[PDB]
Design a binder for these strands. Structure first.
Ligand SMILES: [Mg+2]
Ligand SMILES: [Mg+2]
Ligand SMILES: [Mg+2]
Ligand SMILES: [Mg+2]
Ligand SMILES: [Mg+2]
Ligand SMILES: [Mg+2]
Ligand SMILES: [Mg+2]
Ligand SMILES: [Mg+2]
Ligand SMILES: [Mg+2]
Ligand SMILES: [Mg+2]
Ligand SMILES: [Mg+2]
Ligand SMILES: [Mg+2]
Ligand SMILES: [Mg+2]
Ligand SMILES: [Mg+2]
Ligand SMILES: [Mg+2]
Ligand SMILES: [Mg+2]
Ligand SMILES: [Mg+2]
Ligand SMILES: [Mg+2]
Ligand SMILES: [Mg+2]
Ligand SMILES: [Mg+2]
Ligand SMILES: [Mg+2]
Ligand SMILES: [Mg+2]
Ligand SMILES: [Mg+2]
Ligand SMILES: [Mg+2]
Ligand SMILES: [Mg+2]
Ligand SMILES: [Mg+2]
Ligand SMILES: [Mg+2]
Ligand SMILES: [Mg+2]
Ligand SMILES: [Mg+2]
Ligand SMILES: [Mg+2]
Ligand SMILES: [Mg+2]
Ligand SMILES: [Mg+2]
Ligand SMILES: [Mg+2]
Ligand SMILES: [Mg+2]
Ligand SMILES: [Mg+2]
Ligand SMILES: [Mg+2]
Ligand SMILES: [Mg+2]
Ligand SMILES: [Mg+2]
Ligand SMILES: [Mg+2]
Ligand SMILES: [Mg+2]
Ligand SMILES: [Mg+2]
Ligand SMILES: [Mg+2]
Ligand SMILES: [Mg+2]
Ligand SMILES: [Mg+2]
Ligand SMILES: [Mg+2]
Ligand SMILES: [Mg+2]
Ligand SMILES: [Mg+2]
Ligand SMILES: [Mg+2]
Ligand SMILES: [Mg+2]
Ligand SMILES: [Mg+2]
Ligand SMILES: [Mg+2]
Ligand SMILES: [Mg+2]
Ligand SMILES: [Mg+2]
Ligand SMILES: [Mg+2]
Ligand SMILES: [Mg+2]
Ligand SMILES: [Mg+2]
Ligand SMILES: [Mg+2]
Ligand SMILES: [Mg+2]
Ligand SMILES: [Mg+2]
Ligand SMILES: [Mg+2]
Ligand SMILES: [Mg+2]
Ligand SMILES: [Mg+2]
Ligand SMILES: [Mg+2]
Ligand SMILES: [Mg+2]
Ligand SMILES: [Mg+2]
Ligand SMILES: [Mg+2]
Ligand SMILES: [Mg+2]
Ligand SMILES: [Mg+2]
Ligand SMILES: [Mg+2]
Ligand SMILES: [Mg+2]
Ligand SMILES: [Mg+2]
Ligand SMILES: [Mg+2]
Ligand SMILES: [Mg+2]
Ligand SMILES: [Mg+2]
Ligand SMILES: [Mg+2]
Ligand SMILES: [Mg+2]
Lengths: 70, 271, 114, 88, 101
RNA sequence: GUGAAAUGCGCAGAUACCGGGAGGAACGCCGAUGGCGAAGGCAGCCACCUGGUCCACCCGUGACGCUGAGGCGCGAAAGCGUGGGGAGCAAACCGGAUUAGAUACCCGGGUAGUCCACGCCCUAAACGAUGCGCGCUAGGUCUCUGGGUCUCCUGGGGGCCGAAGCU
RNA sequence: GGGGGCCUAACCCUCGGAUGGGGGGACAGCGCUUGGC
């Protein structure tokens, strides 16, 4: 419905720095988005999450943003 | 860790003595400005003021550097770790490059040939002492002054130690070996690390005799006496406390705080 | 404490009783209510209706101080969940926002026997 | 881990001929190094048991091979075993 | 010797003068551990997802080095000692794995 | 707090809200019909030390193999020893309720223990209830991992349906 | 007059003599008086 991968070109998904890239996988809660929404490969999804977490430690990414309007 | 003994005699089957591995091939103490006379089982009137003392082995007194700030910046080599019959801890005879020699309580980890030093400058390398206000919050530390310029008095027993909990004004929070939370002053020096010989708490005297060599006379129960001697006296056949447990002087002795009330030292503590 | 127009509303809703607490932008409370305050006791306290009434009462008491604008913040799952909110609509306060800040561990503390 | 170079100091030294990278002499030497590495490791990581199994396997693998070499030729054995210094 | 990517995050509310002072300690320590540097990046202040040390912002760095893999742990220890250092993090350098290429 | 309650806590100011601090234990989303390990078993992140395993090149030694009584090593949870640590949970224990009774299921309390170091214990539905190795005997489909110019071929794992056959 | 906070110089502790430095501090100690155990 909006495969996150096709929404952006070539990118080094190991880079734990490009916020605008990774940020598009975190949902409106900080929850690392499922492979049923990122559409990545088995390996892709993995090394991804690892680099995401890496970022969240430097403060480049949220652990949980509170649920907005509802 | 601790030397045991085969039961070739009773009371030898149980007794364990400390291993002196750390003790650096040094029997004699630093005869120099280090040893000194020592004595005495009761007070300056002839009267006994501490029951059940005396008879211990003879002992020379090793002079220990507790201030360690009169040699700021001057480094020193850890020449030796020596045995010391006056404290639970082992001591370290260090040779200052200055040429002067001094005894410091040897901490854990410390071993001969350390470039130990003391001053605000000093690194957070173990063995080094520096005013509390400079030591990074969290660092375990020992041999702390209580007020500035009055030598170490906290955490000196074997394997003891206090931790820095945080700051607040000119004071730093410590958690003493007891567990007390306390605001100690900033300028108060404190040598980094924890006290050597932590295995001490694990020796087992084994026989009644061993206690005697330590200068401890036998200790007699209140119950074993007569009413004339002790509150618990009157032992008409192994009898129970007449209520409620009390000292030879008549004050209660099972939970009964004795710390003074309006002590000024009070407001610097936290339970 | 003092009179203020802007503010916030916290909705605590557990399966056993719902409770709301109005507070100024800093977070410091102004007024509160709950199934017990209203009059209900025991099982009824968990009722969405109870939760409704308490919401109105807390809102009502609030408008008295000067409350008008209020960001809504919910923590719970109780029957008065959205119900407390539906009551903040018709409250007479401007429902400036609505957010779920229900606490939830990243798996750390062992739960009760349930 | 063992350095790529460190392996050659061994391989080059134990081969019977240039390009030899499989002679019993070599495999044994190649294990022996790797064995002693683990040995010295577990000497500090007493708790690491899974790795200790590795050591048993590797020690066993070596143990077999020496049977074989001592079997078909006692000469390279009495020598090789001596160079690496084992069996004692 | 191995390649690393030493991140470091410092207190933003400090002056620019002491900023140079802390950067000095970074270097000396780096050298004391034979951390010969390479392509370095200093992305300055940035938006933190969560208040690190009660502070909504933070000054960033990022290096790349060769050094004995043994003294890499000891190094991170030396860095964190400063108060204005909020987040040291050494990482194994890795060739860019890429998808959607 | 429950089926409803009561014990409990609360005007000596509790619950609900915000800020600041201490401490222990476990790792949400990723995450799954998934991966690793000989088994027991193993999950935030980081670095260090280390075991096993798979694919390719067809270069090396040339049967050096398989199994394996004893022996040795590992071996969940509980439990034991000495000494640490103790937030949550929680046998025993205490109270409330339920019931004819209720040493229980439910509720309020609660200690060993759960955690760390070192040393024992050596059991289990330690279950695939399926000992290890090697060759042989249709395929269809889902998935994990590797190699090759790649709508397909070629290895090694994890599943389901099913030839022959077995039962 | 009561309560909170800070100060230093009484008073107390301490620092290689100090007419001074550091720490505590109108507290504590001590005097008279009050009630209690
Ligand atoms: Mg003399
Ligand atoms: Mg004397
Ligand atoms: Mg010297
Ligand atoms: Mg006695
Ligand atoms: Mg008698
Ligand atoms: Mg008499
Ligand atoms: Mg009496
Ligand atoms: Mg009497
Ligand atoms: Mg009798
Ligand atoms: Mg009596
Ligand atoms: Mg008693
Ligand atoms: Mg008294
Ligand atoms: Mg009801
Ligand atoms: Mg084997
Ligand atoms: Mg032959
Ligand atoms: Mg042998
Ligand atoms: Mg032998
Ligand atoms: Mg022999
Ligand atoms: Mg031998
Ligand atoms: Mg022999
Ligand atoms: Mg009160
Ligand atoms: Mg209050
Ligand atoms: Mg709460
Ligand atoms: Mg709080
Ligand atoms: Mg604070
Ligand atoms: Mg605690
Ligand atoms: Mg903590
Ligand atoms: Mg599984
Ligand atoms: Mg396996
Ligand atoms: Mg299982
Ligand atoms: Mg697990
Ligand atoms: Mg782990
Ligand atoms: Mg699992
Ligand atoms: Mg091929
Ligand atoms: Mg050939
Ligand atoms: Mg050949
Ligand atoms: Mg061959
Ligand atoms: Mg041939
Ligand atoms: Mg067997
Ligand atoms: Mg256990
Ligand atoms: Mg205990
Ligand atoms: Mg215990
Ligand atoms: Mg409980
Ligand atoms: Mg219970
Ligand atoms: Mg009880
Ligand atoms: Mg009955
Ligand atoms: Mg019972
Ligand atoms: Mg009973
Ligand atoms: Mg009974
Ligand atoms: Mg009961
Ligand atoms: Mg029943
Ligand atoms: Mg307990
Ligand atoms: Mg027991
Ligand atoms: Mg316990
Ligand atoms: Mg535990
Ligand atoms: Mg621990
Ligand atoms: Mg045994
Ligand atoms: Mg076991
Ligand atoms: Mg099973
Ligand atoms: Mg089988
Ligand atoms: Mg292939
Ligand atoms: Mg195609
Ligand atoms: Mg194939
Ligand atoms: Mg697999
Ligand atoms: Mg297959
Ligand atoms: Mg007036
Ligand atoms: Mg007036
Ligand atoms: Mg002054
Ligand atoms: Mg002053
Ligand atoms: Mg004077
Ligand atoms: Mg002054
Ligand atoms: Mg003063
Ligand atoms: Mg006074
Ligand atoms: Mg008086
Ligand atoms: Mg009295
Ligand atoms: Mg009384």
């Amino acid at each position: 419905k909006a495969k996150v991968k096709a929404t952006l070109g070539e990118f080094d998904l190991r880079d734990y720095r490009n916020v605008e890239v990774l940020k598009r996988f975190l949902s409106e809660t900080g929850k690392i988005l499922p492979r049923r929404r990122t559409g990545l490969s088995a390996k892709e999804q993995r090394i991804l999450a690892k680099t995401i977490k890496r970022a969240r430690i430097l403060g480049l990414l949220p652990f949980t943003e509170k649920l907005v309007r509802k | 860790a601790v030397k045991k003994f085969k039961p070739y005699t009773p009371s030898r089957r149980f007794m364990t003595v400390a291993d002196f591995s750390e003790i650096t091939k040094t029997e004699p103490e630093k005869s120099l400005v280090k040893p000194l006379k020592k004595t005495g089982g009761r007070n300056n009137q002839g009267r006994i003021t501490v029951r059940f003392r005396g008879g211990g082995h003879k002992r020379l007194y090793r002079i220990i550097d507790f201030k360690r700030w009169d040699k700021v910046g001057i480094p020193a080599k850890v020449a030796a770790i020596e045995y010391d019959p006056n404290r639970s801890a082992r001591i370290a005879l260090l040779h200052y490059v200055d040429g002067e020699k001094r005894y410091i309580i040897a901490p854990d980890g410390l071993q001969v040939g350390q470039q130990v030093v003391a001053g605000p400058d000093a690194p957070i390398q173990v063995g080094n002492a520096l005013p509390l206000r400079f030591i990074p919050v969290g660092t375990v530390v020992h041999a702390v002054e209580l007020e500035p310029k009055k030598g170490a008095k906290l955490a000196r027993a074997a394997g003891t130690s206090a931790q820095i909990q945080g700051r607040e004004g000119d004071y730093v929070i410590l958690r003493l070996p007891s567990g007390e939370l306390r605001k100690v002053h900033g300028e108060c020096y404190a040598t980094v690390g924890a006290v050597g010989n932590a295995d001490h708490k694990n020796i087992v005297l084994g026989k009644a005799g061993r206690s005697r060599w330590l200068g401890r006379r036998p200790h007699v129960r209140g119950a074993a006496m007569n009413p004339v001697d002790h509150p618990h006296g009157g032992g008409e056949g192994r009898a129970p406390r007449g209520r409620p447990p009390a000292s030879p002087w008549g004050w209660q002795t099972k939970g009964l705080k004795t710390r003074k009330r309006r002590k000024p030292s009070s407001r610097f503590i936290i339970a | 404490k003092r009179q203020v127009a802007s503010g916030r509303a916290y909705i605590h809703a557990s399966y056993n009783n719902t409770i709301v607490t109005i507070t100024d932008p800093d977070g410091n409370p102004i007024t509160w209510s709950s199934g017990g305050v209203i009059g209900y006791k025991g099982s009824r306290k968990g009722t969405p209706y109870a939760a409704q009434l308490a919401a109105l009462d807390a809102a009502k008491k609030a408008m008295a101080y000067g409350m008008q604008s209020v960001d809504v913040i919910v923590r719970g799952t109780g029957a008065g969940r959205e119900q407390a909110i539906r009551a903040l609509q018709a409250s007479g306060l401007q429902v400036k926002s609505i957010v779920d800040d229900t606490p939830v561990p990243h798996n750390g503390c062992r739960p009760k026997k349930k | 881990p063992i350095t790529k170079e460190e392996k050659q100091k061994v391989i080059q030294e134990f081969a019977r001929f240039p390009g030899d990278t499989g002679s019993t002499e070599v495999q044994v030497a190649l294990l022996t190094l790797r064995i002693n590495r683990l040995s010295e490791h577990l000497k500090v990581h007493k708790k690491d048991h899974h790795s200790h199994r590795g050591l048993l396997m590797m020690v066993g693998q070596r143990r077999r091979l020496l049977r074989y070499l001592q079997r078909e030729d006692p000469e390279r054995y009495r020598a090789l075993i001596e160079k690496l210094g084992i069996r004692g | 010797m191995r390649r690393y990517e030493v991140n470091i995050v410092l207190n933003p509310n400090l002056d620019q003068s002491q900023l140079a002072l802390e950067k000095e300690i970074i270097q000396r320590a780096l050298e004391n551990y034979g951390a010969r540097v390479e392509k370095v990046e200093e992305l300055g202040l940035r938006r933190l997802a969560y208040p690190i040390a009660k502070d909504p912002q933070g000054y960033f760095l990022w290096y790349q080095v060769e050094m004995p893999e043994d003294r890499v742990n000891d190094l991170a220890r030396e860095l964190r000692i400063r108060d204005n250092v909020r987040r040291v993090m050494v990482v194994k350098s890795q060739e860019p794995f890429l998808a959607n290429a």
